[PDB]
Amino acid sequence: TKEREKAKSRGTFQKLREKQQLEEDLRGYMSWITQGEVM
Amino acid sequence: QGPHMALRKEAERQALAQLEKAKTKPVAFAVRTNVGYNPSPGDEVPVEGVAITFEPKDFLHIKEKYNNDWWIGRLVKEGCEVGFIPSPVKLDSLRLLQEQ
Amino acid sequence: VPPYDVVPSMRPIILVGPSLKGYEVTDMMQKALFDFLKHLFDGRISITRVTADISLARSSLAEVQSEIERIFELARTLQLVALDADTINHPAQLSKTSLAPIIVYIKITSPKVLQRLIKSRGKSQSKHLNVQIAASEKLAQCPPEMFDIILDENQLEDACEHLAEYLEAYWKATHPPS
Numbered sequence: 001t002k003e004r005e006k007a008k009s010r011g012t013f014q015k016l017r018e019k020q021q022l023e024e025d026l027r028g029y030m031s032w033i034t035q036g037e038v039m
Numbered sequence: 040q041g042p043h044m045a046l047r048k049e050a051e052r053q054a055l056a057q058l059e060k061a062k063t064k065p066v067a068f069a070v071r072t073n074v075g076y077n078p079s080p081g082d083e084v085p086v087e088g089v090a091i092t093f094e095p096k097d098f099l100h101i102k103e104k105y106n107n108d109w110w111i112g113r114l115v116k117e118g119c120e121v122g123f124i125p126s127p128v129k130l131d132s133l134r135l136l137q138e139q
Numbered sequence: 140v141p142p143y144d145v146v147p148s149m150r151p152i153i154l155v156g157p158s159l160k161g162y163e164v165t166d167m168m169q170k171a172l173f174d175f176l177k178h179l180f181d182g183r184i185s186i187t188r189v190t191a192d193i194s195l196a197r198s199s200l201a202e203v204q205s206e207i208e209r210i211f212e213l214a215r216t217l218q219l220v221a222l223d224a225d226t227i228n229h230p231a232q233l234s235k236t237s238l239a240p241i242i243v244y245i246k247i248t249s250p251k252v253l254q255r256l257i258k259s260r261g262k263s264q265s266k267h268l269n270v271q272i273a274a275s276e277k278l279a280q281c282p283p284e285m286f287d288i289i290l291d292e293n294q295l296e297d298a299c300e301h302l303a304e305y306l307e308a309y310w311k312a313t314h315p316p317s
Contacts, residue, residue, distance in 0.1 A: 021249075022252065024293060025248070025249060025252050025293050026252070026255075027293070027294075028292075028293025028294050028295075029252065029256055029293070031171075031294065031295045032168045032171050032172070032295075033167060033168060033171060034171075035171045035174055035175075035295060036167050036168070036170040036171025036172075036174055037171075038174070039174045039177065062315070065217065066148045066217060068145060068148065069145075069146050069147060069148045069214075070143040070144065070145065070146065071143065071144040071146045071239055072142065072143065073140070073141075073142045073143075073144075074142055098146070100148055100313065113315060115312050115313055116312050117308065117311050117312045118315075119315070120315060127141065127142055127143055130142055
């Protein structure tokens with residue numbers, strides 16, 4: 001637990017937050033084109 | 040008195056039947072408001088109590104025209120009924136009455 | 140200064156400017172957003188395609204006013220109006236006419252992902268990198284309260300939950316019960 005605080009305090013929190021939210025925004029931006037590829 | 044209540048009380052019930060028979064009429068034209076206005080007791084309202092108020096940048100679906108000083112229409116809001124919309128010449132008459 | 144302005148009885152729904160229109164990006168990301176507008180209010184909506192610039196009251200005054208009065212006809216039967224515009228890219232662009240449309244804003248929550256949509260549409264859109272997000276950052280220089288509907292939900296069922304429930308709450312406000 002003392003090491004997850006020292007991985008909070010280097011930089012590592014955003015890596016599983018940004019790339020998480022860069023993925024769910026990637027999957028959501030695909031539907032805004034591909035639901036108009038059909039109709 | 041007794042001679043003044045024979046025509047004043049007969050005009051409130053005549054204007055209430057016109058207001059009740061205009062809710063089923065379709066919307067003729069809508070207006071976009073720019074200023075704020077609230078109903079008061081000395082605004083020469085035909086049916087005292089069935090008047091509506093509007094703030095700036097509000098929408099009014101006017102049903103019909105009652106007279107040259109009051110319109111009939113409703114407010115764009117969930118649950119609101121028809122009401123008395125002041126005409127633009129009534130809004131010009133209410134402003135010059137505050138100076139005189 | 141006139142206190143009252145002649146507006147239509149039903150406001151037209153305008154899916155305007157997440158990124159700048161006139162590309163494969165914004166048009167076909169708005170073209171998808173008339174697919175859910177196609178059958179959801181079917182029978183109580185009027186879907187049309189806007190060609191002329193209605194922000195002039197280019198095209199003359201006769202060709203634009205004939206399309207403005209066409210919107211005036213669609214508000215007579217008390218039904219919803221949808222506009223597929225390809226030139227509208229600001230709220231203040233449609234603030235001088237007598238229509239007052241619903242500024243539905245498709246919101247782009249992160250500008251860093253927007254340049255990766257440019258790289259995903261091939262090399263055709265890659266020559267329009269910084270100019271698109273420029274006034275789509277002036278669509279961030281707009282205050283968000285200047286719009287009417289803002290869509291920042293990424294998924295389809297989450298972005299259409301705001302698209303359907305806000306117009307249903309607007310439908311009950313314009314039509315009172317018997």
